[PDB]
RNA sequence: GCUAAACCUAGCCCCAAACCCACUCCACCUUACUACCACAACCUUAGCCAAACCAUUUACCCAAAUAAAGUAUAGGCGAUAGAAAUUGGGCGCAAUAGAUAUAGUACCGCAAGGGAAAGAUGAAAAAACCAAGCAUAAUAUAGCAAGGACUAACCCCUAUACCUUCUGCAUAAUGAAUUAACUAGAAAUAACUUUGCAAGGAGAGCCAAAGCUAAGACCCCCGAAACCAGACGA
RNA sequence: CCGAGCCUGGUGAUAGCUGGUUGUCCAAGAUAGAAUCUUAGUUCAACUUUAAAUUUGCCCACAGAACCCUCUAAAUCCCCUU
RNA sequence: ACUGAACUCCUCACACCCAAUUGGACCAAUCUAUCACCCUAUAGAAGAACUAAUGUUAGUAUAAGUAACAUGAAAACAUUCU
RNA sequence: UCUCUUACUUUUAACCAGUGAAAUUGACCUGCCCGUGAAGAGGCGGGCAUAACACAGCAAGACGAGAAGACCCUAUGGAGCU
């Protein structure tokens, strides 16, 4: 990515990161799960559900996805009626 | 043309030591040299050997008779 | 160092004149292979990492600090007793010598620094006795910083310059944090 | 390394031990400066030590200059008429303090 | 050139003088000097443990040649001058077989005894009277 | 360039008390920057170099190399400012002390060699020095006898510690 | 550096490369999470704890109606017009312990807020702020001086 | 298949006293 | 051998000079003035430079639209690779990614 | 004791300020520097390179610093690209350095074109020591050249040169005649460390569920065959 | 010095390939694998280091971990005590 | 039985024998601020350190006084001869 | 040409005199046999030999010197041709 540009001379983001995650003020990284939209006669009901939910990324994918994007996107935001509100911060976390 | 100050210095004491081995200087009296006073050092004398010596015999010792023609002489003009 | 600009510059490989063809082939003869005769290995060739441009190295530590920074250098004055408090700056004649050697009556020290609250009203006779006098430094109110504070033995203040410092200085703790600069009009402020 | 250095066989001067101890160390001179900080840790040795340490050994006469220099030194001489010079330079008064009585107890 | 080294000169006089006692070039040229004056500290410091060895062996050695010269062998001295509970190290031994060769006949007159005592010992079988330097002291 | 042997001749002593040694009369000089190789020269100063002034003139005149001529002019004017300056009494009663070549300033020519290459040639000089005391020629050091060996040897055996003892 | 390779030569590929495979971000199926961030209305939340402890302070005035401009000069509240600020959200938080009679005016309330307020005799309104006027209304003074 | 020689400056070479 | 022979001229610096007398004065001009001066308006130097701090790269891209119209032709081209050289050392090269 | 060594000042670099020289007589576009006779200029840059290939694509000066913002947006939707409204003299070099510069000269090339090196007395010239290499002064059994030693230089005993790439490597393989000078780690996010202030921090913008401000501390050198544009050459 | 002349410029072209990388001292410190136009290279994992928080880790005894194939060894997993 | 290590004991002392890598304690010289004033101190800075790139420049060696190079004869230096 | 080579002349050569290169060179106080290093030892192990120092020859060894590397493989290196 570019670390310096070469117009104002300060990172950029990689748009491919921001139109696949959605990132959590606390530090987490939401995806969806590859291929939910492929294929869907030949899979399970049970296969399909996994597919439907949103995970998490682990600490690598979370770190490399941070470097890959400004913190602009760090920011807190207060969306009017966001359904991803609750999720924002921790509760009874102890390391 | 090297700036700097300290290298060049340290290389004239270097010559200094250089030119003291070639041509040594006649050795003279320590009497004759920095840092000396000869009742200081009298007292000492006496104390090195612990021996209590009456000082003025001491200095009374020290002196010889050449020395005083030479110091007659020397006086004289 | 926050108004410390860099002048020295150098030359890099590409901004050496000439240096453009390749000084002999790479295989045929017994030398070792080369791109060019302004490389950095080569004498007279262009630097591989020098100074480069005007570089600046400016800088603010915040405002808060830099207020903390006057509080500590006045009170460490009057800690060493180095720090004397006049009513006024005003001399019985502009002789320079009887400065200095009040200064050598009062064991002030070799180098004093007199602080005036403005500029346009110091007394004539301070103004001609100090103009050609090294050592000894007049400055108004607002000039006062901590290097010539540390720099100067001794520091002088008059009355009113002493009300002025207290005013500003305590202004700095127990302010709020500023919606938009200061120079702009405020409610309360100037 | 040994061959690349002189040697000598084990020695005392005059017998020392035979009859009586005589302590080697003649003269001590010390080069200090009132000003500067080479000679800080030297200066308070002066403060201190000098007096009680030259009381300990009477033998020992202490010459002390006090003039300006970069580097403090001090002068061992012995009887046999050996030169040891020493630069104490920025030195704390306990470690200049195990140096004077290095010095003093060797030949 | 904002930054030249000025004292280059001392930094070479440093190996040089190690390397002036030395035989050609490397006694001179630095980039040679330098390689020969390391490995000059490098055998000066694993001489220390064949200094020891080498002693030993030279002690060793002279003790076998007084030994031999009263007619019995090394080991033979050595081994009974312990079971006499005579705590002698080789350095002295060997000092004493030069310098004080008197004593040194003593101690092999002494080690022989001792030796004999021990094959009286060894001809008889269960219990005989104990030979009077074979006698052992304890220190509780 | 240093010229260091020139400013030899200068050298005064103070004058002698009557108890003391005659000492000996001492003269240096030298020619510069002759065309002729340094190791060339060698050879003719080493020749030359504890005979006494006629006899290394002697030597030097049927000697066929072309420095000899040179060394013979060198000495033929040391022996003239001997006389006439350095107050020596006899011109016959000179002995060469030392006599020395020394690598003079040197120019660089090209050499012209097959295809394109080349060589650097040297356009080589060089200095002569020598050195004259007053007086007879030293006798050499007599060859070492059978008996010399023989009593440094008894000397060698007496001078044997026993090592490594107290 | 290590030993020589790419990484010591210093030409090692860019972030998110995984030497060949389908990098971890480009697999991933896209989704709109932001699809759009910036078109969206942000309220900055103002609690009634947060406004009980200003009245108890006295840095906001009841004696007079509260609005944004008077929040925002207290130091209440940080506006950021220019992050997609739309004013002030007023919220449930700290409903009990809440005793203060004020004139209040906010963006957007909840219906306990406006419960909470309204129990005290105060009187709560909503009314919108177009950005062109949110700048003006949080910073008076600047506009003054742009002689518009 | 050739290399062809190379000639250093005439300038060095023509140095007098 | 490379070493001078001789001790250089000493050199005397005059600590008691007017520049050095008043270095550092007026840095105080914003809180004890009232606010009507930044510190940053005692900086003297280039246009591109006054009260402003960046790497190499970014003192190039200020120094290219600030006084870019203004400078010589070669010098420009100077710059102008200069930039070109720099973009690709930082966003291409280096240890870390 | 030779060869040498040593030097401080010519000048130069980056800024600021300010809009620059176009020049007695003669000659000079023909084969320029030669007194003197019947055609005509304006026309998309490409390519290296990045994409770990390459084929669409890949920042380059356009007329106010900051902020808006690496935002909207664009894109083999990937590498990457990227707005607007709006706001407003010297901690420099000092003769291998610094300009290539004592000079675009000498020299090299048919031409375009390439392109050096170097100097040092003193107020007045109308006055001491240190690189390599050698010399003083060749050499005597035996062996990485030394170490342990020794009364003693050698003799005695112990001891498989260095760097770099390979798992070993003694040695194998690259590199070094030697001396002097010159010659190679440049920066972000995020963390940590130390301060100031603290539900607020910051000298507009930005961040904040103890945070925010400031500082400290992390990212090398030399080398291809090539490709393209414009000149020069029969 | 022509499978495509030479010069200048783009140009410090590019080089997963070769070569090099400059003071002292101390400390911790090695070989599960996976994908890859990939095996002369990267990325993830494993190991390694530093700082931090907190509680168990290593060695382990009983009990326990399959039938089928027509036949079964050194052993291994789990594991209180210590 | 003796000999036989850097193992172990002995008298003293103790951070003082791994590659890549990572952590730490110091520090040569130079410039700046302030000291100092026969060469230092506390800090701030930086073109900040070379036994090695068939590195680049200059000097001097090895091969080596080697390879190699050169003027027909006599004479009076008129001339003549081959 | 050879069986099967010989003799003489010139050039070279070797000596005296003048001038004076180049590749090469880690340092060298630079031996032989056997073993080890699997092949490959002047330098490692066991034996043997051995005052020092020029000049002339020779080519068995120094994996002898010098080159735009003959062959095989590799590069997500080029180029010409179809
Ligand atoms: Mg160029
Ligand atoms: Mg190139
Ligand atoms: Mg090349
Ligand atoms: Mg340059
Ligand atoms: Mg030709
Ligand atoms: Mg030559
Ligand atoms: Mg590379
Ligand atoms: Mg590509
Ligand atoms: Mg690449
Ligand atoms: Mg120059
Ligand atoms: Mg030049
Ligand atoms: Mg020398
Ligand atoms: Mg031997
Ligand atoms: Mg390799
Ligand atoms: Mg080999
Ligand atoms: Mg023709
Ligand atoms: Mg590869
Ligand atoms: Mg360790
Ligand atoms: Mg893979
Ligand atoms: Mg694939
Ligand atoms: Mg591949
Ligand atoms: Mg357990
Ligand atoms: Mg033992
Ligand atoms: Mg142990
Ligand atoms: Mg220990
Ligand atoms: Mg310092
Ligand atoms: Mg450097
Ligand atoms: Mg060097
Ligand atoms: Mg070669
Ligand atoms: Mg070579
Ligand atoms: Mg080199
Ligand atoms: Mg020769
Ligand atoms: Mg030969
Ligand atoms: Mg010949
Ligand atoms: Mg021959
Ligand atoms: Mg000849
Ligand atoms: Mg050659
Ligand atoms: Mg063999
Ligand atoms: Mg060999
Ligand atoms: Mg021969
Ligand atoms: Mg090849
Ligand atoms: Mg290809």
């Known amino acids: 990515l570019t670390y310096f540009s070469a117009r104002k001379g300060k990172r950029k983001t990689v748009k491919a990161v921001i139109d696949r995650f959605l990132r959590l003020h606390c530090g987490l990284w939401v995806r969806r799960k590859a291929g939910y939209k492929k294929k869907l006669w030949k899979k399970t009901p049970a296969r399909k559900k996994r597919l439907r939910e949103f995970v998490f990324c682990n600490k690598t994918q979370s770190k490399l996805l941070d470097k890959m994007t400004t913190s602009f996107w760090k920011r807190r935001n207060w969306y009017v009626d966001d359904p991803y509100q609750k999720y924002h911060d921790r509760t009874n976390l102890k390391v | 043309v090297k700036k700097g100050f300290r290298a060049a210095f340290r290389f004239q004491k270097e010559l200094e030591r250089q030119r003291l081995l070639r041509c040594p200087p006649p050795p003279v009296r320590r009497s004759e040299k920095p840092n000396w006073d000869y009742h200081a050092e009298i007292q000492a004398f006496g104390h090195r050997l612990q021996e209590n010596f009456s000082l003025d015999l001491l200095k009374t010792a020290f002196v010889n008779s050449c020395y005083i023609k030479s110091e007659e002489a020397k006086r004289q003009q | 160092n926050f108004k410390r600009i860099s002048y020295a510059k150098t030359k890099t490989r590409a901004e050496v004149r000439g240096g453009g063809r390749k000084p002999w082939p790479q295989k045929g003869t017994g030398r070792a292979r080369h791109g060019s005769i302004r490389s950095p290995l080569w004498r007279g060739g262009g630097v591989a990492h020098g100074p480069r441009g005007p570089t600046s190295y400016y800088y603010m530590l915040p405002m808060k600090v830099r207020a903390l920074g006057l509080k500590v250098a006045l009170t460490v004055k009057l800690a060493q007793d180095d720090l004397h408090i006049m009513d006024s700056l005003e001399l019985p004649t502009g002789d320079p010598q009887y400065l200095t050697e009040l200064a050598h009556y009062r064991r002030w020290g070799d180098s004093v620094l007199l602080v005036d609250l403005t500029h346009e009203e110091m007394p004539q006779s301070i103004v001609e006795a100090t103009s050609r006098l090294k050592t000894f430094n007049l400055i108004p109110a607002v000039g006062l910083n901590v290097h010539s504070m540390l720099k100067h033995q001794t520091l002088v203040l008059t009355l009113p310059t002493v009300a002025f410092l207290e005013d500003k200085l305590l202004w700095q703790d127990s302010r709020y944090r500023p919606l938009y600069p200061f120079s702009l009009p405020y409610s309360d402020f100037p | 390394t040994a061959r690349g250095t002189p040697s000598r066989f084990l020695a005392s001067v005059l017998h020392n031990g035979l009859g009586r101890y005589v302590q080697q160390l003649q003269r001590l001179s010390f080069s200090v400066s009132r000003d500067g900080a080479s000679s800080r840790g030297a200066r308070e040795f002066v403060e201190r030590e000098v007096i009680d340490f030259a009381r300990r050994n009477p033998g020992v006469v202490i010459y002390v200059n006090s003039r300006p220099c970069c580097v403090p030194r001090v002068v061992a001489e012995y009887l046999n008429g050996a030169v040891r010079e020493e630069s104490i330079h920025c030195k704390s008064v306990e470690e200049i303090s195990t140096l004077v009585q290095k010095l003093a107890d060797q030949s | 050139l904002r930054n030249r080294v000025t004292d280059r000169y001392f930094r070479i006089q440093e190996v040089l003088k190690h390397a002036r006692h030395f035989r050609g070039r490397k006694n001179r040229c630095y980039r040679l000097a330098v390689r020969t004056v390391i490995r000059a500290f490098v055998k000066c410091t694993k001489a220390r443990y064949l200094k020891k060895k080498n002693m030993r062996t030279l002690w060793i050695n002279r003790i076998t040649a007084a030994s031999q010269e009263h007619g019995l062998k090394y080991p033979a001295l050595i081994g009974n001058l312990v079971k006499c509970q005579v705590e002698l190290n080789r350095k002295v031994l060997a000092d004493l077989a030069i310098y004080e060769p008197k004593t040194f006949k003593s101690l092999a007159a002494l080690a022989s005894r001792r030796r004999h005592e021990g094959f009286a010992a060894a001809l008889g079988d269960g219990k005989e009277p104990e030979g009077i330097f074979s006698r052992v002291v304890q220190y509780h | 360039i240093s010229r260091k042997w020139e400013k030899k001749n200068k050298i005064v002593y103070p004058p002698q008390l009557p108890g003391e040694p005659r000492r000996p009369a001492e003269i240096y000089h030298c020619r510069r920057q002759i065309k002729y190789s340094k190791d060339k020269m060698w050879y003719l100063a080493k020749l030359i170099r504890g005979m006494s002034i006629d006899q290394a003139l002697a030597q030097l005149e049927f000697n066929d190399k072309k420095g000899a001529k040179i060394i013979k002019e060198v000495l033929l004017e040391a022996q003239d400012m001997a006389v006439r300056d350095h107050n020596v009494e006899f011109r016959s009663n000179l002995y060469i002390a030392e006599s020395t070549s020394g690598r003079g300033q040197c120019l660089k020519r090209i050499r012209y060699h097959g295809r394109g290459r080349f060589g650097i040639m040297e356009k080589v000089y060089c200095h002569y020095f020598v050195k004259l005391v007053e007086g007879p020629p030293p006798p050499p050091e007599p060859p070492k006898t059978a008996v010399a060996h023989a009593k440094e040897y008894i000397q060698q055996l007496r001078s044997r510690t026993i090592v490594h003892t107290l | 550096r290590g030993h020589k390779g790419e990484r010591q030569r210093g030409t090692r590929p860019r972030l998110g490369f995984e030497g060949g495979q389908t990098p971890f971000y480009i697999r991933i199926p896209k989704y709109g999470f932001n699809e759009g961030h910036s078109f969206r209305r942000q309220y900055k939340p103002l609690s009634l704890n947060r406004l009980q402890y200003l009245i108890d302070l006295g840095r906001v005035d009841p004696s007079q109606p509260i609005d944004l401009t008077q929040l925002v000069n207290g130091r209440g509240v940080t506006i950021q017009p220019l992050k997609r600020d739309y004013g002030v959200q007023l919220v449930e938080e700290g409903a009990d312990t809440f005793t203060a009679k004020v004139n209040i005016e906010v963006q957007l309330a909840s219906e306990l807020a406006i419960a909470a307020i309204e129990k005290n005799g105060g009187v709560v309104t909503t009314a919108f702020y177009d950005p062109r006027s949110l700048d003006i209304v949080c910073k008076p003074v600047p506009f003054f001086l742009r002689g518009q | ?17 | 051998i490379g070493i001078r022979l001789t001790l250089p001229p000493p050199k005397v610096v005059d600590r008691w000079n007017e520049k050095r007398a008043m270095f550092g004065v007026y840095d105080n001009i914003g809180i004890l003035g009232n606010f009507e001066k930044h510190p940053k308006e005692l900086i003297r130097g280039p246009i591109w430079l006054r009260g402003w701090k960046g790497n190499e790269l970014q003192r190039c891209i200020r120094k290219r639209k600030m006084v870019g119209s203004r400078m010589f032709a070669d010098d420009l081209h100077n710059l102008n690779k200069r930039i070109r050289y720099l973009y690709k050392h930082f966003n291409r090269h280096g240890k870390f990614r």
């Open chain 8, 1 to 17: 298949r050739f290399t062809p020689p190379i000639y250093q400056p005439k300038f060095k070479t023509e140095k007098e006293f």
